[PDB]
């Protein structure tokens, strides 16, 4: 369009009204005309009118011009609001919605907002089909408007049946247990929406929608229909890696968050090779009882022959809700851990000395094993709007352990994961995400937290762009590196081997945007973001004095930072994450890795 002109404008600059137009064509022209009309109707110009529209082409259709001719009025004030009609009570709440500031500039949008608030107020009490209308009395003697609203509540509606469509795999009870509207009870328009939100939050479905249908031949009953579309939930994985260098190599497992539609969360994994054997079994019942109490647990076995590291154990956890958004968990567990042939080093032997061990320096022939009983607990808060790609709300997950008296180890450990989403645009295509993680563990009774429970940071899940578990303190060895034994260096030597530490802190900020260009097929499955993240890990009780010639690992200020770009995709075979980052702030021994990928 070569030129858009507005004839009769006096209150605003032409450029200000043009700044809201989309033409910058019938649909855009109608949108611009309605935008202009509302823009004026929001500022008291109760008599505003669009008098004519002219659209014409240049000679030979080389160009086009658009002109709109409008008549302005003046700025009216709203003198009061009159409400009448059939109010089945609730007069006080409508009167509260009715309150305005005396002399407030007349605004058509505010009138619509009050009308909708009245419908939503009545809807929560079962008046699903009220008649609400409003109209001004526009005065001439003064620049005032008196607003009248005519309300007729109609009659109360009841729910006859709730049906589900698209429920091909899940049990009807798996969908129905999440409802708040009961059959055979008065309708409440907010309870149906709470049910919709809970069905979305499970994460089993690509979409949930509803329909409230009137029952033919009945003046006061409705049927409520929920329509869902199921998403693939978990995959079986199996493979063999036989070769003459290693011989037999086996891996298998299954993970589902919904097992044949029964609602159970089941994870089974195992693997075998020449040096490691691993197994895991985990089963959880989200509803052990009808009120939402969940029960589950796991068994694990891990045998790493490299030093030798053999452990096994079990965990049983129970949990229950305390509010609509809060749940608590508590449980018990047991771990057996046996280590042998450990390479002598300072950070590990400090602990071993605290446990009462006296191994001989530079002779790797040693052993140590414990049987530990642990009490587990935690709390969770969750109000996210979606399971797969949340757009609003927040989540907090406090968890921890304490050793049970009588165990060989005595310690406690606490972790805290958080995330918050805030939309930028009303369509929720532009969003800003904040994520944090905190953790701290320590000893009781003079002991230290075992090094096999240390915190690690770095990698595609934590701080992107670093090799996994490489952020934090590095091992300092006593006299394969020759300094490991007397055949090499005759003094203490440092290395780049990450060992983790007692405390962790990580944070990131991500800007989530729509894909710059992609077909609609991927509109709900591919999402991209830009990020900046940081974190650090530190080791309290590090003896900065005895080893003052080496880096002081107790200093928490040595923050690592990175930034880059990432993409997430819910591939039919599972969530995938791709990222690239440049660790612009790094320290001694930080091994970078710039292109990272993993399965969610």
């Amino acid at each position: 369009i070569q030129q858009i002109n507005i004839v009769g404008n006096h209150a605003f600059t032409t450029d200000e009204l043009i700044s809201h137009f989309q033409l910058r064509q019938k649909q855009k022209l109608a949108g611009d005309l309605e935008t202009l009309r509302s823009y004026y109707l929001d500022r008291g110009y109760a008599r505003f009118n669009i008098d004519s529209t002219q659209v014409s082409l240049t000679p030979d259709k080389k160009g086009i011009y658009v002109t709109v001719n409008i008549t302005e009025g003046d700025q009216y004030k709203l003198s009061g609001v009159e409400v009448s009609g059939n109010l089945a009570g609730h007069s006080a709440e409508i009167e509260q919605l009715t309150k305005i500031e005396p002399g407030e500039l007349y605004n058509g949008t505010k009138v619509t907002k009050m009308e909708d608030d009245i419908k939503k107020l009545l809807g929560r009490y079962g008046y699903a089909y009220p008649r609400v209308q409003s109209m001004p009395e526009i005065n001439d003697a003064d620049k005032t408007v008196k607003l009248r609203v005519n309300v007729d509540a109609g009659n109360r509606f009841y729910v006859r049946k709730i049906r589900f469509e698209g429920n091909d795999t899940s049990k009807d009870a798996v969908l129905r247990r999440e409802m708040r509207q009961m059959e055979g009870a008065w309708l409440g328009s907010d309870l149906v929406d709470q049910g919709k939100e809970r069905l979305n939050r499970l994460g089993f479905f690509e979409t949930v929608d509803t329909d409230t249908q009137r029952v033919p031949g009945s003046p006061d009953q409705v049927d409520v229909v929920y329509k869902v579309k199921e998403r693939n939930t978990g995959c079986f994985n199996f493979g063999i890696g036989y070769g003459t260098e290693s011989g037999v190599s086996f891996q298998a497992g299954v993970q589902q968050d919904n097992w044949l539609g029964t609602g159970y969360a089941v994870g089974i994994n195992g693997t075998k090779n020449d040096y490691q054997t691993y197994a895991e079994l985990s089963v959880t019942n989200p509803y052990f009882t009808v009120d939402g109490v969940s029960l589950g647990g796991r068994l694990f076995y891990n045998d790493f022959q490299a030093y030798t590291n053999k452990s096994y154990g079990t965990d049983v956890t129970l949990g229950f809700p305390i509010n609509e958004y809060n749940s608590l968990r508590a449980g018990l567990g047991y771990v057996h851990n046996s280590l042998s042939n450990m390479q002598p080093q300072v950070a590990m032997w400090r602990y071993l000395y605290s446990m009462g061990e006296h191994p001989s320096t530079s002779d790797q022939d040693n052993s140590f094993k414990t049987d530990d009983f642990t009490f587990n607990y935690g709390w969770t808060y969750n109000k996210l709007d979606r399971g797969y790609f949340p757009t609003d709300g927040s989540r907090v997950n406090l968890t921890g352990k304490v050793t049970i008296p009588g165990s060989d180890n005595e310690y406690y450990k606490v972790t805290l994961d958080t995330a918050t989403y805030v939309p930028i645009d009303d369509d929720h295509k532009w969003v800003v995400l904040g994520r944090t993680r905190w953790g701290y563990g320590d000893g009781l009774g003079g002991k230290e937290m075992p090094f096999y429970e240390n915190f690690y940071a770095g990698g595609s899940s934590t701080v992107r762009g670093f090799q996994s578990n490489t952020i934090g303190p590095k091992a300092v060895y006593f006299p394969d590196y020759e300094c490991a034994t007397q055949d090499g260096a005759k003094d203490l030597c440092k290395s780049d081997d990450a060992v983790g530490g007692n405390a962790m802190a990580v944070a990131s900020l991500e800007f989530i945007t729509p894909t710059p260009f992609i077909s609609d097929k991927y509109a709900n499955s591919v999402r991209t973001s830009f990020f900046w993240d940081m974190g650090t890990v530190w080791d309290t009780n590090w003896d900065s004095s005895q080893y003052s010639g080496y880096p002081d690992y107790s200093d928490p200020s040595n923050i690592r930072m990175s930034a880059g770009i990432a993409l997430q995709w819910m591939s039919p075979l599972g969530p995938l994450v791709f990222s690239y980052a440049q660790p612009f702030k790094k320290y001694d021994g930080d091994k970078a890795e710039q292109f990272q990928f993993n399965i969610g």
């Binding site: 939930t233 978990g234 995959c235 079986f236 063999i240 589902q256 039919p572 075979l573 599972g574």
Partner: peptide
């Protein structure tokens, strides 16, 4: 539907043969 040392069957199912790396996935 079917399309090809490896092949895909449909949605939810992939197999590869390629000493050996034979594996497959089956999503529920």
């Amino acid at each position: 539907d079917w399309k090809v040392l490896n092949a895909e069957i449909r949605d939810n199912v992939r197999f590869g043969l390629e000493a050996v790396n034979a594996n497959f996935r089956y999503c529920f």
